[PDB]
Ligand binder design. Structure first.
Ligand SMILES: *C(=O)[C@H]1NC[C@@](C)(O)[C@](O)([C@H](CC2CCCCC2)NC(=O)[C@H](CCCC)NC(=O)[C@@H]2CC(F)(F)CN2C(=O)[C@H](C)NC(=O)CN=[N+]=N)O[C@@H]1C
Ligand SMILES: *C(=O)[C@H]1NC[C@@](C)(O)[C@](O)([C@H](CC2CCCCC2)NC(=O)[C@H](CCCC)NC(=O)[C@@H]2CC(F)(F)CN2C(=O)[C@H](C)NC(=O)CN=[N+]=N)O[C@@H]1C
Ligand SMILES: *C(=O)[C@H]1NC[C@@](C)(O)[C@](O)([C@H](CC2CCCCC2)NC(=O)[C@H](CCCC)NC(=O)[C@@H]2CC(F)(F)CN2C(=O)[C@H](C)NC(=O)CN=[N+]=N)O[C@@H]1C
Ligand SMILES: [Cl-]
Ligand SMILES: [Mg+2]
Ligand SMILES: [Mg+2]
Ligand SMILES: [Mg+2]
Ligand SMILES: [Mg+2]
Lengths: 222, 204, 225, 211, 195, 226, 195, 195, 195
C-alpha cells in the first residue's frame, strides 16, 4: 500500500527575547538510517520580518512554507503593501493547515519575529493548525530532549531563591541575544549527542527591528 | 495496553566526586487516574541502591526477589554484595525470563566499599547492561530525562551540587510527562553516609 | 496507488570543480527476473541537464515524454530558446518536483526517485533529488535506492563538504563514480555490469558515455574458500 | 477538565490550561475559554485544532448575526450554529466538547453543552473532558443554588484543582470567569504549582499527599 | 461488580461494596455481599470477572483460615495483603489469570492501627487512606481528596461514604442497587444494616 | 552498530563503533561491542544487545570448560558450531548477529553468524545497520596479502564509513588484533573522532535552588553491637 | 542456481556463489557444494540456516554409518536427506541435490524438493535460477557425455541462470566425482558471461 | 438508545420516555424530554444515536408545522406516521442513515380514536395497542400482554405504566433516571408532572 | 506462451492455443494472434477479458487512423497499446507483443508488459510459459535468420514452454509478416512434442 507520509527528522527551536526573537534548526536531512543532506536549510525568512520552519515531512514542510510565502506576496497586492503582523501571520497559517484537516501536513510549525509593540514573538502550531504564542518552543525529533531544558533555563521552572526554602520563585527575567544563542547552541550540542537524527549543522535566524540576521555552527556529523 | 506505561514514573542516577545520587518520582497511576502519591521506586540491599520503573507489580516482585537473593548472598559470602556484582545479578535474573520478561527499567547505583569508586548502571527489560560513567535514566519520561541530564550534567560534582543537578533534571523531566511526578525522592550516597530528600514539586 | 512492475536500481551522482557527473545501469528488472538489458535511465534535456530515474520504468517513460514535451513548449514563441530563455536544470527540476508532490497528494504517485544533474547559465553546479513523496534535497553527492547505502559513503570520502568541491577534478570524480558502480554490481542483487555515465562541465558542455562496463573485478580469492 | 454551573449570582466558568500529545505535555499555558462577545463564553475540550478553529468561526457567525439582525445572538442560537456545524461533520472524526455560557435579556443566564456527536443540552451544571468525573465529585457535593459569588468562584477553582490533581491529562493552571447580566468578568489565572499548596494549607484537605 | 470503596479513618476501616449482580440486560440479584472475612480483624472486598471473583475470594479465605489454625495466631493485615498480592502476581503470568481486584481492610491488633490495602489483578499493591476499583475512583478520589481528614471518627467516616454513594447514584450510568457497608475495628467486623 | 573483520598475512582483526541506542535515542555514547569468547577468540555483535551478550557469555563459558576437559587452546570452529546450533534451535527468536574471529592451533579464522543459525566464511565481513557502508569501503580497498598495519587501517576506515553515513552507528572505533603466536591486543577507543566540544555555559546551580519538604539519614550499615 | 549431471566417467555438481538477504548480496563467493562422504556431495538451495543445519546432520549420520557399516551408497545419503526434509517439512525451506560416485552403480543424482520426496534422475536442476534453464537443459542434455562435455553443459546452463536470475551470481563452482577421486573447478564472470 | 414506551387505551395514547442522557461514564443530564410535538394532537418520542435523534425529530416537526400552515389543517396520525416511515425508509439507503427509533402517539379528531405507531430506523411501521424500542420491550411486552385491556381509562393506563417502569427500575442494568410521561387525547397533549 | 522474432525477410509471431480457468482448460485451440492492421499483429497474454477489450479498442483506433492518415507504423500500434495499458494500469492484467512489417522499417517487434512500459527488441517472449525458455531463446537467437530458421527457432522455443508450463498447450499457431503479405502456420502436438 502507498504511504504518502515520511519522516525527514531534524529539530527546530524558537526563543522570544524582549526586543528580538530566534528560530534555529539543524541542517541535517534523513530517511530511516540514511543521511540525505548535511546542509538542507529548514528555517526560512518569509519577508515582513517573519521567520518560519515546518519540521517533520520535508515535502509537506516545503509545500506549507511556499504557500505562506505566497500568502505574504498576495497580502501586499490585496492590502496596499501593508506589513503582515506576526499575530495575523499565525492566524493565516492556522487556516492553511486546517484547510488540509482530513489529509494533514505532517509538520510542527514555529514562526518568530516581533509583535506590533516591537517585543519578541514565537508562535507554534500542531499539524492541523491549533496554535499559541509562547516564550519558548522546541519542535520535531528532539522536542522532548529540549523543551524541559527550556522550561528550566528560560522560564526558571523548579528554581527558587536559595534560603527561601521554596517560598520565593527565581524571578523570570528577559535574556540577552548572547544568552539566548548560548542556550540554543547548548540545546543542539545536547540534542546531537543523544539523538541520531540531529547533527551536521546549526542555522539560527535572529529577528530584530533592523531585520533578519543568520548565524551558522558546525554540529557532530556521526 | 503497553505494560511499561500503565503505572508511569521515572528513575535517574548520576555520579559525582566520590559520591552517587539516585532519584525517582512517587506517582502510581492506572493510566489517566492517579492512585498513589507514596509509591517509592528506589530500594536498597546493604549499600547498593536499585531504582525500578515500569509495570508496578514487577517493580514490587523484583524488589522482593533481589532482597531474597542478596540476603542469601550475604549469609554464604559473609559480606554485602557490591554494585558491580549486583548489576550482574540483575542482568542474569532478567535474562532468565527472556521470553516472558519483567516490564521494568532497573537502575543500579552505589559506591564500591573497597575501591571507593562511584558506580551506576541501567538495563533494558531482558537485562542488557548500560554502564555509562555520567548518568542513567529510566521510565515514561526517559526522552526528557536524557535531555535534562545531557545539558545539566558536568563530571566531578560535589554531593550538594550533584543534588541540585539530579533534582532539576528529574523535576523538569516530570513536568513534561502526564504519567510522572506527584512527588520525588533524591538519595545522596557517600561511602559511609546516605541522605534522603523529598522534593517539593507540582501535584498535577 | 499502484505497485512498481519493471524497475531500475540506483542512480549515483556528485559535483566536482567545474560541473556534475551522473551514472546508472541499463537494466529493467521484473521482480527477480533481469528482463530488459538495454534500458537508458539517463535522459538528457538540452546540453546543460541530465535527469536520472530509478523505480517504475513505465512511470520513467512517461516522465521522459513530459521532458520532451517541455523542450517543445519552451521553444514556442521564444526567439531565445537556444540562448537566454533555454531550459535550466533548476527549471526542469522544479517542474518534476511539482508533478511528483501533486501526484503523491492525489494518492497516485509516479513510483520513482529522480536526480537532476546540470550546470546553470552562470556556471554553478546543479544537483537535486526528488521522489514519489515529493521530498527534495541537495548534497555534493546524491544516490537512489541501493546507491544511498553504498555509493554515498564512497563518494563522500572525496567530497565530504561544499569546500571539497573546488579541490575535486573530473578524473578523480569519474574514477570514484566508476568504482561506486563496481561495488553496486558486487552487492546489489538487481544491478547489471552495463551502465551509462554523463558529465556536465561548465567549459566542455555535456559528455554522454553509453555502453560502459564494470572491469578490474576481484574474484580471485573465491578458489581459497 | 472544564466546568460551568448556574447559581443565584449568574454563571461560574472554570477550565485547566494543559494540552497533551498522548503522554507528552505539549503546553501548561493554553487557553480553553474563547470570549465570543462581552456576554458569551465558549469552553474547549477535545482536538486542539477542532476547538480553536470552529470556535473562533462561531465567533464570526455571532458577529454576522448582530450586524444582520442589529441585536446580539441568543445563547440558544449561538450554541445551535455550532451543533449544526459539527452535525454536518458527524463520523468524519471531529473531536469537540463545548459549553456555550452567556447572558441575554430574553433567556437569562444560560449554559448549552455541545459535543461533536451533535448532542446539544441545556442545563444548570456541566463538566467536560478527561477530568470531568473528578471535577463532578467536588462540584456536585458542595453545590447549592444560593452560593455567594465568592464561594461559587472558589468551588469552581477548587473543582478544577481536584481534576488537575487526579487526572494525568488536566493541569497547568485554572482560568476563572463569572458571567452576570452585565456580561463576563475574568477572575484570573491560578497556577496549580502554588494553588495546590495554598489550598492544602488553608483548607486542611489533600491529606493523601506528602505535606 | 464495579463498586468497591474503602476508607481508613482514625481507629477503623470502612468497606462499601455494590449489591447488584448483572448478567446481560438483567439484574439477577440486588443483595450480593462482595466480601469475605479472611480473619476476625481482616475483611476483603472484590470486583472483576464472573466466577473468578468468588473462586479467588474463597481460595484466599481458606489459606488464611489454614494459617490461623496451624499457628493458633492471626496474620497482620500487612502479611495477608502481601500473601494476596503475590497470589495475583503469580496468576497474571498463568494460562488463565484471575481477573479480580480487591480491597483488604484490617485492624492490626499489635500496632492498634486500621489499614487499607488496594491490590489490582496484576498484583499492584498500595496502602491508602482511601481507595476504589474501576470507575468509582473517577468520582470518589477527588471527592475524598477534598473532604478526608486522617483523624476522622467512624461516624464521620460513614457520612463521608454517604457523600461518595450519592455522587455515584447521581453520575454513574448503571444501577448498582446500593452498597453493603462493613466496619473493621479493634472489636472485629460488623455490618451497618441501615444505609 | 557497524562491525567488520579483516584477515591478514599472519592473523585476523575485528573492529566496531561504540554507540548503543534505544529507538532513535543514544543510551551509551561509548559502549563496547567487542566481546571475548576465549582469550584469543573475540567476536562483535549487532541486533538484540542482551541476546548477543547472553550468547557470547554462554558459549565463552562452555568453550572455557571444553578447553579444560581437552587440555587444548580452544578453536574458533568450535565457538562457530556451538553458536549456530544454539541460534538454530531458537529459530531466530535469539536476535544475535555476530562476526567471530580468533587465532588457534589451526591458524587464524573469520566467521559471521545470523540469528537463524546461518554461518559465513570470508577474508573480510561486515554486519549491522552500518554493514553496507562498511562493505563499500572493504570492496573498494581490500587486497590479498594485507599486513597487520593495512588490515587495522582498512578495518577502522570501514567502521568510520559506518560512523559518518549510518545514523545507527557513531562515536569511537574499537579494534582487536589477533596475530598467530602472539597475545590478542584489544585497542579500546583506538580512534576518538567525535569528542563533544566545550559547552557555552556551566549549568551548575546555586545551592538552595531546589525546594525540599523532608530530610532524613538512611542506615546502609548492619545492626551494631552493644 | 544448482545442478548435477551424470555422465560416462562419473557425475558433475555445479552451483553459483551468491547468498542474498532480500536484494542485498550477503556473500558473493560462497561454496554451496558440501561433502557428505569422500565421493558423495550435496548442492544446497533455500534457507542458509535450514540447509546448513540439515547438511551438518547428514555429515554426522554418514560419519557414524562409515564407522559401523563402511562406505554408504549415494542412495543412502539421499534417504537421510529425504527422511529429515519430510519429517521436518512444516519448518524447512530446503531444496537439495545429492550426487555420488561408488564403483558398482557409478554416477547417480538424487533431488529432494520442498515436500521431502526423492527423485533419481540422469540430471537435476534446482534453486530460483533453474526456472530459466528448463528449456535449455532439456534440449542440450545427452546420456553418456564426456567430462569436457558435461562441465561445458553445466557451465552454459548456470551461465544463463546467473544472467536472468537476480538471486544468482558470482563464480560457478563445480565438483567432478570419478574413480580418480574429487576435482574442484571454478569459473569466473569474464570466462562464462561471454559464452 | 434509552427507554421509550407507548400505550393506547380507550380515548388517549400515553408516552413514557427516560430522562437520562449518558456519555461514557457520566450522566450529563437527568431531566431530558425525548419528545417533540408534531402538531397539537400528535406527539413523537425518539431514541437512538446522539445528535441524530434530536436532528431527525426537529426536521420532522418543521415539515409537519409547514404542512399545517400551508393547508390550515392538521394531518391525521395515520398520515404523519406514513410521512415519518417514508423519511426513515429513504434514510436507511442514504450515505449516513438516521439512527433513530420513534413512537408516534396521536388522537385522530376525525375518527375520535387514539393511535400508537412504532417505527424503527429501517422505516418498519406497525400500529399497536402498546409498543417499546430497545431493551425495554423485552420486559414490557409480556407484562402488558398479561395486564393490558382494550377499554382501559387513562388512569388505568397510567397505573399499568407504573408497573412497566417498576419492572425496568428492578431488572434493567442502567439508571435511566425515571420517565417524563405525556397523554395525547381529544384536548391535545399534556404532561403528568408527578411520576 | 507467445513470442515474436524479427528475421531478414520480415517478422514471425507465434503462440500456444490454451485458455484456462484455474487448472481447467476452457478452450484448447484458441487463436491468440489478432490482426491490428493488414501487416500488423498482436499476441495476447493475461486476462482473456482485459486482452480482448484492449485489442478491440486498438483495432478501432487503427481503423480510424487508416481512414484519416493512411497505414500506421508498427510503432504507432505499440503506442496505442502502451497508452491504454499505462493509463489503465490499476485495472488491467495484460501483457502484449506487437509485431508488424512496413516497407521502410521492415520487421519490428514491440513488447508492453504489465507496467504499461514499451520496449523495442529483436525478439520478445511473454506469458507464463516464457520463464522456462529465457535460457534457450538467448542462446539460440541470431540476427538476420531466414524464414525457415525463424519458424524452427519459434517452434522449438514454444514446444519447450508448452512442455514445462501447465498453463500453456494445444497447437502452435504462427503468423509470418513479409512484403509478400501474411502467411498463417499451425503445428500440432505430434509434430513439435518429438523435437
Ligand atoms: C480536561 O478534561 C482537559 N483534558 C486535557 C485535554 C488535553 O485532554 C484537553 O481536552 C485538551 C483541550 C484542548 C487543549 C488545547 C486548546 C484547546 C483545547 N485537548 C488536548 O490537548 C488535545 C487532545 C488530543 C486528543 C483529543 N491535544 C491535541 O490535540 C494535541 C495538542 C497538541 F498540541 F499537541 C497537538 N495535538 C495533537 O493531538 C496533534 C494534532 N497530533 C499529534 O501530535 C500526533 N499526530 N502525529 N504525527 O483539555 C481538556 C480541557
Ligand atoms: C540458485 O538457485 C540460488 N539462488 C539463491 C537461493 C536464495 O535460492 C539460494 O538457495 C541461496 C544459497 C544458500 C546459501 C547458503 C548455503 C545454502 C544455499 N539461499 C540464500 O542465500 C538464502 C535465501 C533465503 C530465501 C531463499 N539467504 C539467506 O538465508 C540469507 C542469509 C542471511 F543470512 F542472511 C539471512 N538470509 C535470509 O534470507 C534471512 C531470512 N534474512 C532475511 O530475509 C532478511 N535479511 N536478514 N537477516 O541459492 C540458490 C541455490
Ligand atoms: C502463454 O504463456 C500462455 N499462458 C496461458 C494463459 C492461459 O495463461 C494465457 O495468458 C491466456 C491468454 C489469453 C487467452 C484468452 C485469449 C487471449 C489470450 N490467458 C487466459 O487463458 C486467462 C488466464 C487468466 C489468468 C492469467 N484465462 C481467463 O481469463 C479465463 C477465461 C475464462 F473465461 F474463462 C475465465 N478466465 C478466468 O481466469 C476467470 C476470470 N477465472 C478465474 O480467473 C479463476 N477461475 N478459477 N478457479 O495465454 C498465455 C499467452
Ligand atoms: Cl538470520
Ligand atoms: Mg507530570
Ligand atoms: Mg494531573
Ligand atoms: Mg491498584
Ligand atoms: Mg502444458
Amino acid at each position: 500500500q502507498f504511504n504518502p507520509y515520511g519522516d525527514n527528522g531534524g529539530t527546530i527551536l524558537g526563543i522570544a527575547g524582549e526586543d528580538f526573537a530566534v528560530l534555529a534548526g539543524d541542517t541535517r536531512n534523513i530517511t530511516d538510517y540514511s543521511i540525505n543532506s548535511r546542509y538542507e536549510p529548514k528555517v526560512f525568512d518569509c519577508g515582513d520580518n517573519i521567520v518560519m520552519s515546518a519540521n517533520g515531512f520535508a515535502a509537506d514542510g516545503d509545500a506549507l512554507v511556499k504557500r505562506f510565502k505566497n500568502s505574504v506576496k498576495w497580502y501586499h497586492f490585496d492590502h496596499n503593501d501593508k506589513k503582515l503582523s506576526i499575530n495575523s501571520a499565525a492566524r493565516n497559517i492556522q487556516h492553511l493547515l486546517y484547510g488540509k484537516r482530513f489529509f494533514p501536513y505532517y509538520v510542527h510549525t514555529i514562526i518568530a519575529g516581533l509583535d506590533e509593540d516591537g517585543k519578541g514573538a514565537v508562535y507554534s502550531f500542531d499539524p492541523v493548525g491549533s496554535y499559541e504564542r509562547e516564550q519558548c518552543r522546541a519542535g520535531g525529533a528532539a522536542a522532548s530532549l529540549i523543551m524541559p531544558f527550556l522550561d528550566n533555563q528560560v522560564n526558571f521552572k523548579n528554581q527558587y531563591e536559595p534560603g527561601t526554602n521554596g517560598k520565593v520563585k527565581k524571578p523570570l527575567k528577559y535574556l540577552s541575544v548572547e544568552e539566548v544563542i548560548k542556550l540554543v547552541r547548548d540545546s543542539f550540542t545536547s540534542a546531537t549527542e543523544r539523538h541520531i537524527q540531529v547533527g551536521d549543522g546549526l542555522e539560527i535566524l535572529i529577528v530584530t527591528k533592523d531585520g533578519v540576521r543568520k548565524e551558522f555552527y558546525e554540529l557532530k556529523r556521526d | 495496553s503497553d505494560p511499561s506505561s500503565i503505572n508511569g514514573g521515572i528513575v535517574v542516577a548520576m555520579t559525582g566526586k566520590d559520591c552517587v545520587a539516585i532519584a525517582c518520582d512517587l506517582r502510581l497511576g492506572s493510566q489517566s487516574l492517579g492512585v498513589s502519591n507514596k509509591f517509592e521506586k528506589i530500594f536498597h540491599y546493604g549499600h547498593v541502591f536499585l531504582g525500578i520503573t515500569g509495570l508496578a507489580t514487577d517493580v514490587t516482585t523484583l524488589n522482593e526477589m533481589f532482597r531474597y537473593k542478596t540476603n542469601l548472598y550475604k549469609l554464604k559470602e559473609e559480606r554485602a554484595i557490591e554494585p558491580e556484582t549486583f548489576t550482574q545479578l540483575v542482568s542474569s535474573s532478567l535474562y532468565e525470563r527472556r521470553f516472558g520478561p519483567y516490564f521494568v527499567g532497573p537502575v543500579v547505583a552505589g559506591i564500591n566499599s573497597k575501591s571507593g569508586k562511584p558506580f551506576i548502571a541501567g538495563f533494558d527489560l531482558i537485562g542488557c547492561i548500560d554502564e555509562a560513567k555520567d548518568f542513567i535514566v529510566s521510565g515514561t519520561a526517559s526522552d526528557q530525562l536524557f535531555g535534562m541530564c545531557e545539558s545539566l550534567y558536568e563530571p566531578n560534582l560535589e554531593p550538594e551540587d550533584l543534588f541540585e543537578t539530579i533534582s532539576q533534571a528529574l523535576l523538569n523531566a516530570a513536568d513534561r510527562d502526564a504519567l510522572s511526578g506527584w512527588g520525588a525522592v533524591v538519595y545522596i550516597i557517600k561511602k559511609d553516609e546516605v541522605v534522603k530528600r523529598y522534593l517539593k514539586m507540582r501535584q498535577d | 496507488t499502484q505497485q512498481p512492475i519493471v524497475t531500475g536500481t540506483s542512480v549515483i551522482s556528485m559535483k566536482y570543480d567545474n560541473g556534475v557527473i551522473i551514472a546508472a545501469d541499463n537494466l529493467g528488472s521484473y521482480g527477480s527476473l533481469l528482463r530488459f538489458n538495454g534500458v537508458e535511465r539517463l535522459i538528457p534535456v538540452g546540453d546543460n541537464t541530465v535527469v536520472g530515474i530509478s523505480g517504475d520504468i513505465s512511470d520513467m517513460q512517461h516522465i521522459e515524454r513530459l521532458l520532451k514535451d517541455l523542450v517543445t513548449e519552451n521553444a514556442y514563441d521564444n526567439p531565445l530558446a537556444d540562448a537566454e530563455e533555454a531550459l535550466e536544470p533548476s527549471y526542469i527540476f522544479e517542474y518534476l518536483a511539482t508533478v511528483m508532490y501533486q501526484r503523491r497528494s492525489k494518492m497516485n504517485p509516479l513510483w520513482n526517485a529522480i536526480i537532476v544533474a546540470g550546470v546553470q547559465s552562470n556556471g554553478d553546479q546543479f544537483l537535486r533529488y526528488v521522489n514519489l513523496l515529493g521530498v527534495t534535497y541537495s548534497s555534493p553527492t546524491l544516490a537512489t535506492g541501493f546507491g544511498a547505502h553504498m555509493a554515498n559513503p564512497l563518494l563522500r570520502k572525496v567530497v565530504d563538504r561544499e569546500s571539497d568541491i573546488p579541490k575535486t577534478t573530473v578524473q578523480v570524480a569519474e574514477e570514484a563514480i566508476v568504482n561506486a558502480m563496481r561495488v553496486l554490481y558486487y552487492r546489489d542483487a538487481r544491478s547489471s555490469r552495463n551502465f551509462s555515465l554523463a558529465i556536465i562541465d561548465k567549459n566542455t558542455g555535456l559528455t554522454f558515455k553509453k555502453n560502459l562496463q564494470v572491469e578490474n573485478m576481484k574474484w580471485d580469492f573465491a578458489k581459497d574458500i | 477538565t472544564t466546568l460551568a454551573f448556574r447559581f443565584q449570582g449568574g454563571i461560574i466558568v472554570a477550565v485547566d490550561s494543559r494540552a497533551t500529545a498522548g503522554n507528552w505535555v505539549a503546553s501548561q499555558t493554553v487557553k480553553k475559554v474563547i470570549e465570543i462577545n462581552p456576554f458569551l463564553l465558549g469552553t474547549m475540550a477535545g482536538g486542539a485544532a477542532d476547538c480553536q478553529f470552529w470556535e473562533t468561526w462561531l465567533g464570526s457567525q455571532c458577529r454576522l448575526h448582530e450586524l444582520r439582525e442589529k441585536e446580539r445572538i441568543s445563547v440558544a442560537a449561538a450554541s445551535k450554529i455550532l451543533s449544526n456545524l459539527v452535525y454536518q461533520y458527524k463520523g468524519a472524526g471531529l473531536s469537540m466538547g463545548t459549553m456555550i455560557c452567556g447572558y441575554t435579556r430574553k433567556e437569562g443566564p444560560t449554559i448549552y453543552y455541545v459535543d461533536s456527536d451533535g448532542t446539544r443540552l441545556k442545563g444548570d451544571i456541566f463538566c467536560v473532558g478527561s477530568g470531568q468525573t473528578f471535577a463532578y465529585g467536588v462540584l456536585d457535593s458542595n453545590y447549592k443554588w444560593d452560593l455567594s459569588v465568592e464561594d461559587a468562584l472558589y468551588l469552581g477553582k477548587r473543582s478544577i484543582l481536584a481534576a488537575a490533581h487526579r487526572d494525568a491529562y488536566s493541569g497547568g493552571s485554572v482560568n476563572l470567569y463569572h458571567v452576570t447580566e452585565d456580561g463576563w468578568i475574568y477572575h484570573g489565572n491560578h497556577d496549580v504549582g502554588e494553588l495546590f499548596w495554598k489550598v492544602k494549607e488553608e483548607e486542611g484537605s489533600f491529606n493523601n499527599v506528602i505535606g | 461488580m464495579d463498586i468497591i470503596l474503602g476508607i481508613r479513618v482514625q481507629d477503623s476501616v470502612i468497606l462499601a461494596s455494590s449489591k447488584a449482580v448483572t448478567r446481560g440486560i438483567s439484574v439477577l440479584k440486588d443483595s450480593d455481599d462482595k466480601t469475605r472475612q479472611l480473619s476476625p480483624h481482616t475483611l476483603m472486598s472484590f470486583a472483576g470477572e464472573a466466577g473468578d471473583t468468588v473462586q479467588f475470594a474463597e481460595y484466599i479465605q481458606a489459606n488464611i483460615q489454614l494459617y490461623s489454625i496451624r499457628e493458633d495466631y492471626e496474620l497482620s493485615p500487612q502479611a495477608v495483603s502481601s500473601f494476596v498480592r503475590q497470589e495475583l502476581a503469580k496468576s497474571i503470568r498463568s494460562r488463565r489469570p484471575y481477573q479480580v481486584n480487591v480491597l483488604i481492610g484490617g485492624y492490626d491488633k499489635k500496632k492498634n492501627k486500621p489499614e487499607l490495602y488496594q491490590i489490582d489483578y496484576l498484583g499492584t499493591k498500595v496502602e491508602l487512606p482511601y481507595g476504589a476499583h474501576g470507575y468509582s475512583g473517577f468520582y470518589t478520589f477527588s471527592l475524598l481528596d477534598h473532604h478526608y481528614r486522617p483523624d476522622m471518627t467512624t461516624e464521620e467516616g460513614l457520612d463521608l461514604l454517604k457523600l461518595c454513594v450519592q455522587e455515584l447514584e447521581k453520575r454513574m450510568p448503571m444501577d448498582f442497587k446500593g452498597v453493603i457497608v462493613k466496619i473493621v475495628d479493634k472489636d472485629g467486623i460488623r455490618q451497618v444494616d441501615d444505609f | 552498530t557497524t562491525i567488520v573483520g579483516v584477515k591478514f598475512n599472519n592473523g585476523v582483526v575485528i573492529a566496531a563503533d561504540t554507540r548503543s541506542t534505544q529507538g532513535p535515542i543514544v543510551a551509551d555514547k561509548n559502549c563496547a561491542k567487542l566481546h571475548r569468547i576465549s582469550p584469543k577468540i573475540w567476536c562483535a555483535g549487532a541486533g538484540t544487545a542482551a541476546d548477543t551478550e547472553a550468547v557470547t557469555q554462554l558459549i565463552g563459558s562452555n568453550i572455557e570448560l571444553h578447553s579444560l576437559y581437552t587440555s587444548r587452546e580452544p578453536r574458533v570452529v568450535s565457538a562457530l558450531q556451538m553458536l549456530k546450533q544454539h541460534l538454530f534451535k531458537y529459530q531466530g527468536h535469539i536476535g544475535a548477529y555476530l562476526i567471530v574471529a580468533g587465532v588457534d592451533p589451526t591458524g587464524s579464522h573469520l566467521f559471521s553468524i545470523h540469528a537463524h543459525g546461518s554461518t559465513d566464511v570470508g577474508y573480510y565481513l561486515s554486519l549491522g545497520s552500518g554493514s553496507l557502508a562498511a562493505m563499500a569501503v572493504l570492496e573498494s580497498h581490500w587486497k590479498q596479502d594485507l599486513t597487520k598495519e593495512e588490515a587495522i587501517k582498512l578495518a577502522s576506515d570501514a567502521i568510520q564509513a559506518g560512523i559518518w553515513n549510518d545514523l545507527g552507528s557513531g562515536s569511537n572505533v574499537d579494534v582487536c588484533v589477533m596475530e598467530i603466536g602472539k597475545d590478542a591486543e584489544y585497542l579500546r577507543n583506538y580512534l576518538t573522532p567525535n569528542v563533544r566540544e566545550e559547552k557555552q555555559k556551566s549549568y551548575k546551580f546555586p545551592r538552595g535552588t531546589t525546594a525540599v519538604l523532608k530530610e532524613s539519614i538512611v542506615n546502609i550499615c548492619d545492626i551494631q553491637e552493644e | 542456481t544448482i545442478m548435477a549431471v551424470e555422465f560416462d566417467g562419473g557425475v558433475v555438481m555445479g552451483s553459483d556463489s551468491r547468498v542474498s538477504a532480500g536484494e542485498a548480496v550477503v556473500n558473493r563467493v560462497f561454496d554451496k557444494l558440501s561433502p557428505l562422504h569422500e565421493r558423495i556431495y550435496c548442492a544446497l538451495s533455500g534457507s542458509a540456516a535450514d540447509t546448513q543445519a540439515i547438511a551438518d546432520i547428514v555429515q554426522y549420520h554418514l560419519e557414524l554409518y562409515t564407522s559401523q557399516y563402511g562406505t554408504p551408497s549415494t542412495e543412502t545419503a539421499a534417504s537421510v536427506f529425504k527422511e529429515l526434509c519430510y519429517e521436518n517439512k512444516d519448518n524447512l525451506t530446503a531444496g537439495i541435490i545429492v550426487a555420488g560416485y561408488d564403483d558398482k552403480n557409478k554416477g547417480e543424482v538424487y533431488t529432494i524438493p520442498l515436500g521431502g520426496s526423492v527423485h533419481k534422475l540422469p540430471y537435476a536442476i534446482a534453486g530460483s535460477g533453474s526456472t530459466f534453464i528448463y528449456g535449455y537443459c532439456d534440449k542440450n542434455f545427452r546420456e553418456n557425455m564426456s567430462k569436457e562435455e558435461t562441465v561445458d553443459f553445466i557451465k552454459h546452463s548456470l551461465s544463463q541462470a546467473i544472467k536472468w536470475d537476480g538471486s544468482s551470481g558470482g563464480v560457478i563452482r563445480m565438483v567432478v566425482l570419478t574413480a580418480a577421486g574429487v576435482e574442484r573447478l571454478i569459473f569466473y564472470p569474464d570466462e562464462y558471461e561471454q559464452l
